[PDB]
Design a protein around this ligand. Structure first.
Ligand code: GVV
Ligand code: GVV
Lengths: 264, 263
């Protein structure tokens, strides 16, 4: 992988692996999300990091608030996918990381993603606005003119997501993370939540449809010793679902999301 | 990746990814097992496949009976690991696939693995001996002289594993596979079983020790809708005896052993 000529974005190629594919011999949405994370980590490393010098001094971290992914074509096993990623400040609200996925052979856009990140104190878990000193430290690595993966006016990445009301149409109960679901800091990987959301989609939908869009809001973190319930209700040739992840015990919300599926 | 000069083995390099590492910033044993599986699949593809023409005609498949992995150094995040793999017939019993793992920069061996595979009818699930016709079409892709990743006479890869007796010292119950745990044929990936075995090792062992050796026997397959209990007892470096069994009737799915070195 490498930073592009202007040093304001990063590109990387990936060959899709045998264990990374689903029933259609194409990459799962969790494989795609892991590749978005890997290209994001390589970009931060290439520019000197995603904690800045000031962030480490104040025990501050970047946490995901929202993830939005749209896939037009899933790469097949053995195919090369090229991913370009960049960041932008969104004032004092936080930062945004965007991605464009392309078929390396044709150069055609096969997917796009956008994510909203907020600043949080590592210890107290209290969110806070971005300070000017932090904003200046990462503006030298971001394009100054706006560059959006989802530029459209009424695009799906910025829509408000409602809370699923009981009873759910579908559910998958008692979901627990294992050690493979943890990152290097022993926190549950953000991609695991995408998997848990999808666990409550009925197998007949998975067998006859392909996932086109997934929007996920992150409200609270699941601990290593927490248990999760995944809930889904159809809200609709295309099928749409409303999703909710909540702790199995008290029903505390972990995530809420929406998925859009098109018939194969 | 590519077949070596003689066409009798296959090599591939991998850069260790950020999500592939554990708390020590080094590749997990499940990342290693996934890389062994990927280099195995690429080898089969490069030689024309791991079912042959005769196996497809009779609905025959290769199934894992035993996996044995020994790691001396786990590659760090960003490091390049080179893996060489080859196969060998073991008469009518089945086939063996071996691997050597190296640090790409130093050329030093950082790990090794061996696996025993048996022939099974995909429909009835009945094990069968390897026929002459199948041995013949496999032998042209295997070294004729023996080439062993674990050559030592009476090594850890060929030791008999006993059945854990109740009560277990440690346990992790109610383990269920999700869709990410399935392969392209909707069967539970063999690497998931390694993860489930390790789930019953206490966190204090994981925090103060590194996994050096894991030997795993595969007895039965876990279905998409099955629930598993993972059981561990210390038999001692720290050594453990392991058992995976269905949560309900207690039907055995796997048995294994692990050896851990103090960090
Ligand atoms: C260190 C750079 C960074 O933000 N990494 C990152 C982690 C998770 C996801 C989903 C996307 C990512 O880009
Ligand atoms: C298709 C070639 C093949 O044998 N692949 C394979 C699958 C699983 C494991 C654990 C190792 C492997 O090498």
């Amino acid at each position: 992988g490498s930073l592009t000529e202007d040093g304001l974005s990063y590109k990387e190629k990936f060959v899709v692996r045998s264990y990374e594919v689903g029933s259609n011999k194409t990459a799962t949405v969790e494989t795609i999300a892991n590749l978005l994370q890997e290209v994001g980590c390589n970009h931060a490393q290439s520019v000197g990091f995603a904690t800045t010098t000031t962030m480490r001094k104040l025990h501050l971290i970047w946490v995901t608030a929202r993830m939005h992914i749209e896939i037009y074509k899933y790469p097949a096993w053995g195919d090369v996918v090229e991913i370009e990623t960049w960041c932008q400040s969104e004032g004092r609200i936080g930062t945004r990381r965007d991605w464009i996925l392309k078929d390396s052979v044709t150069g055609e856009v096969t997917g796009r993603a956008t994510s909203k990140w907020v600043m949080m104190n590592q210890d107290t878990r209290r969110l806070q606005k971005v300070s000017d000193d932090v904003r200046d430290e990462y503006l030298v690595f971001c394009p100054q003119e706006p560059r959006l993966a989802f530029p459209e006016e009424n695009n799906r990445s910025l829509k408000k997501i409602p809370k699923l009301e009981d009873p759910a149409q579908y559910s998958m109960i008692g979901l627990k993370p294992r050690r493979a679901d943890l990152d290097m800091n022993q926190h549950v990987n953000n991609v695991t939540y995408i998997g848990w959301v999808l666990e409550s989609i009925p197998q007949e939908i998975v067998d006859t449809h392909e996932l086109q869009v997934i929007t996920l809001d992150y409200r609270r973190e699941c601990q290593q010793d927490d248990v999760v319930d995944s809930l889904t209700t159809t809200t609709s040739n295309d099928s749409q679902f409303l999703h909710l992840l909540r702790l199995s015990g008290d029903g505390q919300e972990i995530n809420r999301g929406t998925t859009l599926w098109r018939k194969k």
